């Protein structure tokens, strides 16, 4: 059965290497979440530092692709960094060639097309990662677009990725049924981060310290990550209500 | 580029791809070459499971490489065209640089060298073809007949046959061909060639092709009626 | 426009006897009307009892001698330490020089 | 060294370090021969947040270079963080030096680090790099070598540096036909980035 | 078993079987010994023949006036690697007017052998080398293995039954290291060392091969009647 | 199955068995460590003395990259050398274009991307080394550890090889007992001790100690080897602790 | 390193089957149903928008794509494969035709170019076939309206009406009963919606259905005025509202 | 490395056969039958479409019969996509010859070159062969009317009448029975249809399941005309011979 | 399958070892070196009596001072000879001298291992290279597809090699004349050959300093065959 080793069709029309790349996604055992506000897009992810000898500041799965675009990865770090470096180069080249900042959805499509090539070309393996791109696009506003090893991509009102992704997904679904809208009706990004953390706590059923989380925020004309103290400040506000 | 080594040695010291190329030659229609005192004759079998053929336009079994040299073959027909084309090009190239047409030995050596190159080159299989190359050197009246094979070895023959049931016709030629006295005339040489094919062919109708080559670029192909006369003559002498 | 050649002056002289041979050359090196060095040797022992000088444009002269000295070294490696005969050296040098037929070494060589 | 009939950026450009950082300054004029193709050009251009450059020589060449440098420094930032002004000058040099025969670009690089404060690197036609306290360049700079050498002082204030640039470029404009229009300036400090403009009615009667 | 088809494949225990099979080719090769003092470095090599009618396979190759090696295993592979060393020694002379350090020589060989163990299609080198030389930091002896591993030593030996000579040198370490300014005695110690790897056969005039390099001695090889002194 | 026969093939788990097999080669190698300190880093390694015939001090395993980065590794030594050769090219092109010497995090990703690239195709073999490296740059001191998969993180202390667990345990104690920080000269002494303690897992052949360090104050931000009196002082400190 | 797969990954089996093409067609069978119907004055192409998640915005994912102003495309099978084919199809329409003749290619020739690309993925080294079947509707001056199907093998056939994917067998039967040569465009849209309701299981509205037409020229969608000969694109994607209007009188 | 997954498409069997060529021929034997018959005053090309659907657009369709130039046409049997690759190459080759010599390409030369391309895929490159067999029908001023066939092996032969694809064994026997040398085009048209009508796997032979073409000198004075039959024209010729 | 350049567990290259088996199937070739010259002889082995034996070219000239005999897949030797001839003439062009026999052999042997995944497989032919130069005098070399070459006083290759080599062991001494060597090649060839030895199915050649490399005529060899039979009957 060499049809399970490289990216060619099986008798039932399947690509097993692509399917197994999906299972590599959860190898890190980390859950991520993304939501949109009025003026912003917030992304959050679990941060697990098991070894005491590790420098915790260097342990990250969130990346600043361009000034406007941010990316969180679910999957092993080598493949994650591989994808990050390529996305950075693609976003830089786009700006040079076409005279304006690469939109979030366009970068997502580009990376998805690259992922598709690996599912069709034999010598290249798929990357075992799911890439979640976030920004505040100057045309489409707050944006969430997610890529997988199959080469599939789509926009999102909100989304979640990881081992306990389904619990987070339904938690968010039930909120948007209730609110009757496509986003978090909130002015400041600070409270949108508080929403994101609150609903992750409810879905996963765990409490979080400042070092157990990692947060990325996209606003108009800049994407940035939060420090431990920025998150701690945010955790205090949730507890006091 | 496709690099795979297809022709390789086996534990017992054999290159199976070259040997399997010989099996393709063994499948091919029989071809025979007989050289007389002042001529060479190339005989060729044509299988009769194909009726409704158009013999005007169907590729002939014997091919002119130059005006003084001819090449017949046994094995894969498509493969033979590639060797014939290369040989024809080399024939014109030799005239251009040496200001003299190729010798039969030189042309054979070139074709054999091409066949050999395909036995130790990556990404290619050997030619499923053995050839009989015959003719006369420039300003020379000594007849020349050479044989090549997929491995790339070549050699000169007083008379030789290749293809299916070639071991039967080789047996015939080995007792019927005298080294001390070869076929003195054209008629004698053609008759011996037709006789040898009649040991294998079936019917002497549109199954046998004969091509006669004489010195100073004198090559001609026999028609059906002309060949049929040899068939009619041999059978009447046989009933004895 | 950049001119890749120059004239370093100087002169050389070779004479052959019955059982010996001399190769002489002055030690002055110049450009235009200036003296660069009063002692800059341009006659070299290249091994195997072969002496060589390549006079004219010194950069080309040095490059050539350097390449021939290297040719002698590899001759030993490739042919079981065989002594390079003077006639063989001469033919080898021809190929060094003609190798740059279309961008020549501007030198007069004597061995 | 200019290609025939191509737009000429001949200029009056200068960058001056001072106590709080560095200030870039430039005129506004472009010529093809004696005709002023653009009278309101912006010759001060951003390659990074607080790393800018003054352009002179060929308009097309300097633009193409500046666009490439901006691309390199944006990619540098994504991997290694904020680049030094020296790093930016090095990228300019690499382009100017390696393509010295096909290019006519006299560029002044000026930036503000927090560690290194205000820095100025000038890059003439050859592609050489020269780190200086202040720098002048462009067709009109010849006329103000005397003036600028006599009047420049290290560790000046913002208002003094603005006056030094204004008076200098005013003279360069007055004597160089290839220079003119408005005087644009860009201030680089820890505070941020400030754009200044000065019109003929003001600076001519200095 | 299933993991020895090519060099690009690791075994479940983390082994490269093709590299190990290349190492095996060295063990089948004829014995050769290397040792040094502070002034000189010596190579001794037992040459092998096909039969009495044949010549004896040459084991020692000169790389420069100050450097050379002895081989054990596939001889053509030693020719490729020795040629590479000759070029690198030569590049150092022409470009930098500098004699190549014996340590750099080892580093260059290591990196050349390594590339052949990480790529598809190619194969590992099937030969072991003992490199001796005298450079600006005195005498040197190196041991090259086609896995890539290069090691600097006082003395060593590679090939069939090389353990006997390697044990002897391990005992004699304190004696032969101090043989300074005496070539013939350092060779004698090397000839006695290789003698501990002999079985049924003894050292004859066209069997033994010796090479030396040192302070005021260029790399030179001794064969034939020139080694009769040491029997 | 057969999923472990070819590199870059995902198993049904989502694993690359060939990379995991390369880790086994690393585990088989000698112990090497890295210790991050106040204003720099310290590297140490175990050199097994196979024979009396090995020249002491003359089989150097720790390698310098540029003038400010130190690299040490465990596993297939040649593979480590190949990685360092690449590192030196990466560092050279960075300094060529950007003038400044390559930052350590920058350098870490250059190796990471290169090693990761060797898990993408079946025509190449994964690296059979875990590499501990780091140095001093504009932002201060950094210590990293890189694995066959391409995975790397920053570290306070790092260890790999046959005695990694013993070394890790000893490293964890230093991090707990010194929250404010460890000095450069102290880290050299500690490095010696940890190698000697980690040698208990490889105690058939006796060994030779080798230490290097980068420090903003002690070495002026450059990579240097520890030799002579400072080396013997560190050895004596380690000898006293085992007894 | 380097792509060492210079050899075919699709080969003939003893029975004469090209396995990878067959398996690619199996992947198309699993795919969601899509269809195309040809009228006298237009063409309609339609498909279901299978949403991966309700949080996902199905508007961002477009199954029906514009290739030229007068040509559109829809698929069944693997979405990613389709997306890159659309990119290549749009480019080839320019490079191999418009940049030569100064006008857009007719439907049949653009289809031919797409087929060529899919055939090469069947024979070239180190690649698998595309796991999709396309339906391409289009108009051009000299051929009028036309509808084509393109399979993983690279084979293409012209259709009066057809369906591909999940429930194609039943859907083709339904179309045989309803199709005639006198159908107006509005009648063809009505039949398309009826045919698609049979295969769709969940919600059936303008937000879950994607439908586009090739019909009359649309000057309002051109974007400029002043050139009489330029009258606008014949390709138009029906809005969510426009679909729901026709679902009431169903 | 990649050696593991190589099918080795261009090798010999122990018996001296080319595996992939043999399997490509097996594929072609399931394709719709195509017949070529050469008369003294023209050539007929007839071909059966593969199981037609009633909703297939028949008039604006091309599956079997393709035009190479004004004087040469081909009938296809096998993978259509493969055939179109080869057809465009053949069309280009014909135009290269015309551009070079200012003369229409001789039929055999075009056939040889196309057959040489197929041969290449069996000897080198490591790719699968083209799963196609052609019947070439054409005219030139040297040999007049000519019929050839080529197959995945790259071997070509000339014919008076020939069939490719499905049921060639049965079809060739019927052609061999009723064919004669002094035959006219109109008679050859009737023979082509009668042969398909008996060898077909369908219930009855109809206009919608056929492609038909002639190459006559039926134009005005010493010039050749290619007629690709329309649906209604096939319907009429089918009634005229009394099949429907 | 498996790689072309793969090592066996014993430490040998599979393809090189398999090519050596092909050489054992080949026709016999013998070479003997003396102080008066070097003699080269081969078994022609015609597959059929109709084959004109004089066209069987298994002894070949490389230069005036270097000859060559072959055994195994003889078609593979053509490009080896072509290379040798070019190497020999090229060296004369660069250095105005004859090229050493050893250096020529080394040049040919460099081709041997230039195979893998360069050519697709090793050569399936062994060569006996005989010659003379001023430095090392008369020489005989055995060049294998392994890239290895040994110098020999005498050597036999091919199907009857092990039997012929044992015979050469006893018969060879350092004072052999050229005539004695000629007869010795014929004697040993007649012993190992299947068919009966005569002038048509066996060929002799030699290389001397004075006259260079010469292939003997069938008339000359026939007399040496007759001289050989008479001498064996004489005791
Ligand atoms: Cl793309
Ligand atoms: Cl401008
Ligand atoms: Mg980042
Ligand atoms: Mg793949
Ligand atoms: Mg002015």
Numbering used by the authors:
A (entry chain G): 2 to 242
B (entry chain C): 1 to 240
C (entry chain L): 1 to 111
D (entry chain N): -9 to 196
E (entry chain E): 3 to 233
F (entry chain F): 2 to 244
G (entry chain A): 1 to 250
H (entry chain B): 1 to 244
The authors write:
Yeast strains carrying the single mutations β1-T1A or β2-T1A, or both, are viable, even though one or two of the three distinct catalytic β subunits are disabled and carry remnants of their N-terminal propeptides. For subunit β1, this process was previously inferred to require that the propeptide residue at position (-2) of the subunit precursor occupies the S1 specificity pocket of the substrate-binding channel formed by amino acid 45. In subunit β1, we found that Gly(-1) indeed forms a sharp turn, which relaxes on prosegment cleavage. However, the γ-turn conformation and the associated hydrogen bond initially proposed is for geometric and chemical reasons inappropriate and would not perfectly position the carbonyl carbon atom of Gly(-1) for nucleophilic attack by Thr1.
The 20S proteasome core particle (CP) is the key non-lysosomal protease of eukaryotic cells. Its seven different α and seven different β subunits assemble into four heptameric rings that are stacked on each other to form a hollow cylinder. Only three out of the seven different β subunits, namely β1, β2 and β5, bear N-terminal proteolytic active centres, and before CP maturation these are protected by propeptides. In the last stage of CP biogenesis, the prosegments are autocatalytically removed through nucleophilic attack by the active site residue Thr1 on the preceding peptide bond involving Gly(-1)45.
